[PDB]
Each structure stands twice: as C-alpha cells, then as structure tokens.
C-alpha cells in the first residue's frame, strides 16, 4: 500500500478505512470529544481487538474511572475483560485519585507515570496503550503552558518506547476548540474528534480524523453508532461506485406492469414509485414483497407509516395473505417511526435486518416518510446509503415516494432523488368527469425499453387493474384533463342494439 | 371515549414550529390508534379554491382515510363539494359530489359530470351538445321504415 | 450518557403536572397498532356509503377543505 | 368588458345560511347598491371572467 507511515488495525467497523489503515504504529492518536461522545469505548475497543485478533497485549491506564468499573461496563458490549486482565493480555493500570486525598500531585507523578506505564509495557510486552482522560490530571490547578510540556513529555517518551498509544480528551463545545487546553491538538500526531451534535432535539454522533501526520485519510465527519457491538461507522463517501449490474429480470407482482417494464424489473435495480397520497404506492410494494415470497426468496418491508397489523388488514383486503408470508419465513415486516431515531440509526436498523435474514428483495414504503424534519442533504445522503447497500448486494429495491401535492406536482422528487434511482413508477390521479380516477405510468427504465403510455388502473379486492390510456385527453398530467375528440366511437366494438346478456345466461 | 375529534389541528399549528407540530400529530394519532379510538381531525387548507395540497405541514400520509371539501364556483355562485380521497382498506366513492347545507345537515347530491377542472374551484361548463353526438338530428338515414 | 448500558438518545418533552414529572417518549411508542375490519357510521348516511360502509373503528380520518366548506359540520 | 366592476359575497357564516351567489354592486352618493350576480360568467372568483355565451343547446 502506497503510504509511508506504518499502520495497525483497530478492527472497528469503519475506522480502518476512514484512517486509511489504522493508527500509525509507534505513534499517539488523540481521540477527543464531548461528554458521552464515545471516547473511552474507542480506547477499550482499541485494546480489545488487539488482544482478540492479533494477540497483542495492551495497557489501559484509567484516570477517573475505577479499574473495577471499566470491566463492569465493558460487559455491555459483551467482553470479559476480566478474563483478559486475567490471562495477562490486558493490564489495567489504575491511577484514579482517592476518596480521602490531599491536593497537589501532577508533575513529578507525570514523571513517575511514564516509568510506571513503561514497566507494565515492558512487563506484559504490550503493543497498544490507552490513556483515558489525561485532562482530569490537569484539572487540579493548571494552564496551557504546563499542559503542552507535560503531555509532550508523556507522548514523547511513549513514542521512544515504541507503543502505539491513544489518549482521550474532553471538550465543552462540539465544534469549537478540539480539546480543553486548546493545546493537545498540536502535541499529538493524529487527532480523532468525536462529536454528538444535537439539532432538532435528536442526537447525531460522528467521528472525524482532522489530521494524520504522515498519511491520507477520509476527511470530515462520518456517522457512527454505538450498538451492543460497540462503535459502528459508515464511510458513506468511501462507498465506491462499482456495484454489479445484470440483465436478469424479476416480477413486480403485477403482470401487465411487467410488460410495461420491458419484461419484468431488473434484478439489480433501484425502483421508485411516486404518487400523491392515496394513489396506490403502498399496494404495489405489497404486491412486490408478496411475489418475492411466492417464488421462494426472502424480502423485507420497512413500514414507516402503517402498523404491522394494519399492513396486514389492507394487505389481506387486497388479497395476498401476509400472515402466511411471515410464517413460511419468506417475508419479514419491520415497521417503525422515522421519529424514533436519527437516520444514522434507521440506516443501520435496516442494514442489520438485511444481514440477519439475507433478503433477495427489499421495499421501503415512503422514503419521504424518512425525510420528515431532517435536512434534504442529510436525507439525500441517507437515500444514497440504502440505495448504495442494496445496489452492491444484488438486492432489488422498491422505494416509495409520496409527493406533497396531488394533481399539479411539477416534480416527482421534491427531494431530488430521481437521478440516483434506476427505474421510476408513477401513479397520479386524473380528474375525469367529476371523478377521481387513477392512472399509472412508467417514466424511465435505464436498461429496458418500457411502454410509454400513461395507462389508467383501478383497485379492486383483487388488486391493480391496468386498463387503457387517455388518448383523447390533453393536459393529462395537469390532473384535470381537457377532452378533445377526433373519435372515441371509432370501432373497437360498435354493433348497436342488443350487445350484452345479463346474469341469467349468455 | 370510543370516538375522538379535534377540530382544526390547523388551529394548533398556530405559531408553533412545523416539526413540533408534525410530532404532536403522531402523538395524538398513535395514542388514538392503540387505545381503540376512532378519530376525525379537522384541517383548514390555508387557501380556498386551487389548493394543490390538502393539509398544510404535510400530515396527509400519517392518516388512513381522507375526506375533502372544496368550493366550486358555478353560475356565479359559491357551492360546496365533497370527496373521499383515499381509504387504505375500503373501496370509497371516486366521484366528486356537491352538497347543500340546511337545517337538517348535509345532503350529498350528485357530481359535476358535465364539468372539467373542478379541483380548481372554477370549473369549465362543457355540455355544448351532450353525449348524443352530432347525431341529435339522426342524419336522415332513418327515412326508411314508414311507408303507406 | 449512561456509562455501562444503552439509552434513548435525545430530548423528550415532559410536563410537570399535579401528578409529578410525566415524560412522553414520543419516539419510544412503537408502531404496533392493532387493527380490524370493523366500521362505524359518521352521522352522514350517503357519506358512509361513499367510504364503502363507514369509517373503520381503528383508523384516523382526515377532514380538509377551505374555511367555510364545513368540516366542523361533518 | 374592460371595466373594473365589483362583487360582494357572503363567503361563510357559521350560523345563518347566507347567499351563495357572487353579486356585483356599485358605489354612488347613496352608498353601496348590491345588484345581480354574474350568472352568465365563468372563473368569476379569479377576477378576469370569461362569458360562456353558450350557443343555447343549438336549437
Ligand atoms: N451496549 C450499549 N448500547 C448502546 N449504547 C451504549 C452501550 N454501552 C455504552 N453505550 C453508550 O456509550 C457511551 C459511553 O461513553 P464511553 O464510556 O465510551 O466514554 P466517553 O463518552 O468517551 O467519556 P466519559 O467517561 O466522559 O463519558 C454512552 O453515550 C452510552 O449511551
Ligand atoms: N380493498 C380495496 N378496494 C378498493 N380500493 C382499495 C382497496 N384498498 C385500497 N384501495 C384504494 O387504494 C388506495 C390506498 O392507497 P395505498 O394503500 O395503496 O397506498 P398509497 O396510496 O401509495 O399511500 P397512502 O395510502 O399512505 O397514501 C386508496 O386511495 C383506495 O382508493
Ligand atoms: N343553518 C345553516 N344553514 C345553511 N348554511 C349553514 C348553516 N350553518 C352553517 N352553514 C354554512 O356552513 C358553513 C359553516 O362551516 P362549519 O361550521 O361547518 O365549519 P368549517 O367550514 O369546517 O370551519 P369554519 O367554520 O371555521 O370555517 C358556513 O360557512 C355556511 O356557509
Ligand atoms: Mg462523559
Ligand atoms: Mg469515558
Ligand atoms: Mg402509503
Ligand atoms: Mg397515505
Ligand atoms: Mg374554517
Ligand atoms: Mg370552524
């Protein structure tokens, strides 16, 4: 690899990419951040993996937290650090002050600590080191001058020793100065900021690598999530554009539509179904999921508008029994509120269920449901996510977008996502004779040829009935069309008088 | 209660943010869907006639069934109209029917069938020789049948 | 932060009433809304036909329209 | 016909029944003088009408 600084891997879902490899060996990385941001876990997680993946003993210095707790807490992610502090792979080095302490002790002890840590590192033969909360040490009676010299000593000596170290720093403001003494930022070789920005009463955490002296890396923020498995990052921008494409074709669950799409949706293709409220989108999606299970393949449905129960009531009324679908273990309905978390999370909940079930199809009813509150870019970037994941995974996607203005919407995007999408399906009302009739249309298909009519469709207990086109109507799209006739009575089946039979017999 | 109605959520959206509102909706919507309660929410679309959207803050989708009333200008008169826009589980009538308002209540008459662009408030009367075609005078092909 | 475990992240509106602090985890509430095929009148006959029988008991019916159209009436 | 004429209308009254027609009116030294509606026009509300001059039923 073309870099001149040797790196070691953190094995932290995401980091090693953003850091183009992992922390520079024989160096100190300052992972700083607000209260509760993720800091100390990173640290612990950093020593952990080294142990359980490279068999590299690690030395963890605690400053504020009690050596007991660090183990007690780290059990949340499912790690028996105890057992490691026990097998001689992880040496927790207490330095926490005492409940009956004096006052004054942070200079000669800073000299003693070096030798300290230097003992355990030589003793346990360690490669990785964590120094959690150095800050607290200066929080006794210090100022900028004495902090840069004192830190420096520690890192300077540490580097000489050959240990790949991580220090943690607290900071009051999320975007302002990196660290408290606004001095740690230049004493370290690397600087890993961790934030947890608020905005819209929700909470968004992000990781950013300001600098990595010696090599390159991904710049700016990247969202991460602390799950039962610890830190989890999304290089939404490291998501290269090299997915696979195939001319394979699958069903839509709606026959006539299939034709309308050159012969059935492409396996590898994103599908968009936009249409004013009450046009039908939800249905089709259900008919898409259904069929996927009627061919014996898995598929998920993430409902953000309707309940799991109701999704079935209206689903059954349209025929297709979801009750069974669930039972045969072929269709899985998630179903939740977009307000019950930030996108980062929602994007991961979805990803998860896509790995504990391995669908071969997926449908997200109302992307626009997720665009609530959130900023366009934030939402657009999330769309690229799901869309991204499903694309490189051969998993057919059908997204649902509901335009905020029925009849008269000059744009079926509203959030402008129609260019990331491969194939769009359009549903819109049509005002014909004091009646709200429906009508579907196939706008685009990147690989197919698809029908160019704006056919009308009707909903029955049976489903989507794709009838005929409003040829003799102008200003269609306008919603309330204009009837201009050159014909209509034209053949097709003239023959007047008695043409029908009735219910008795024909 | 077994039934719950809040008249004019558009009366609540007053001043409060758009998101604070949206949330509030869900807050009163979900709690009503779980507690086995039937709810009707009144909303006043800021603009009479022409309204391209039937809510305000885009609550629309977070609902099951839509009932719509819209002013229709006819022969120099302001007459109402109603329509069941969408029903997630039922059939519901597609047509747009006009209606009176007296001392008895609402009488859902017929639909402006001989009209166009109704959803605009100001429709376009278009009877001008109804569905009987230019064959209202039956050409004259029917001059063979009656003899002596 | 809740060192050691997990938690709901973010703000949540609470109201200090005559029954102490009451927090509405507006995000916590799940999307498990029981449903059924039961319908109920409206007080408008024809209207009920227009729905195809009557509003479902377990549902949310929205009434929009310009000032004056008569939503309060319905 | 190229003239800024008026039009009064009782848009909504919560109790009463009020007139549903858009009646034009005029202003003289005697005050307002409500008149007849625009029965024969279209798009009245918009402002710029459009007579219908429907050719009857064409005999
Ligand atoms: N199993 C878990 N699932 C979800 N979140 C968790 C879990 N365990 C811990 N957390 C979260 O991890 C965070 C704990 O932060 P951590 O111990 O990593 O150090 P810190 O935030 O960097 O520093 P400090 O000691 O000042 O809080 C909290 O915000 C908490 O909600
Ligand atoms: N059993 C049924 N019989 C006849 N029509 C039905 C039936 N179920 C639903 N419909 C029709 O289907 C529409 C319901 O919309 P649908 O559930 O397909 O999702 P949508 O229009 O994409 O999104 P949303 O309903 O959330 O607005 C209604 O407008 C209604 O006319
Ligand atoms: N007794 C009545 N007779 C005839 N018309 C009536 C009578 N009462 C009310 N109306 C008509 O119905 C309308 C009343 O509106 P309604 O009370 O139904 O509530 P709304 O239109 O939903 O909301 P808002 O009253 O705030 O505009 C009046 O504008 C009027 O045209
Ligand atoms: Mg903290
Ligand atoms: Mg910590
Ligand atoms: Mg829907
Ligand atoms: Mg909807
Ligand atoms: Mg009103
Ligand atoms: Mg009112």
Residue numbers in the entry:
A (entry chain F): 14 to 519
B (entry chain A): 372 to 519
C (entry chain A): 224 to 297
D (entry chain B): 446 to 504
Authors' own words:
To analyze the phosphorylation patterns of KaiC P-site mutants and to visualize potential conformational variations in the vicinity of bound ATP and residues 432 and 431 at hexamer subunit interfaces, we determined crystal structures of the S. elongatus KaiC single mutants T432A (TSa), S431A (TaT), S431D (TdT), and T426N (nST) and the double mutants T426A/T432A (aSa) and S431A/T432E (Tae). b KaiC mutations xyz or mutants KaiCxyz are sequentially shown in order of sites x = 426, y = 431, and z = 432 where the wild-type residue is in upper case and mutated residues are shown in lower case, i.e. Tsa or KaiCTSa, where the residue at position 426 is T, the residue at position 431 is S, and the residue at position 432 is mutated to A. The crystal structures of the KaiCTaT and KaiCTae mutants are noteworthy in two respects. Among the structures of the six KaiC mutant proteins reported here, those of the TaT and Tae mutants are the most intriguing because they imply that T426 can be a third phosphorylation site. Therefore, phosphorylation at T426 seen in selected subunits of the Tae and TaT mutants is most likely not a crystallographic artifact. Rather the crystal structures have preserved a third P-site in KaiCII that appears to have evaded identification by other approaches. The T426 phosphorylation site is not a substitute for S431 as demonstrated by the arhythmic behavior of the TaT and aST mutants.
The circadian clock of the cyanobacterium Synechococcus elongatus can be reconstituted in vitro by three proteins, KaiA, KaiB and KaiC. The crystal structure of KaiC from S. elongatus revealed a hexamer in the shape of a double doughnut with approximate dimensions 100×100 Å, whereby the N-terminal CI and C-terminal CII halves of subunits are joined by a 15-amino acid linker. Two phosphorylation sites (P-sites), T432 and S431 that are both located in the CII half were identified in KaiC.
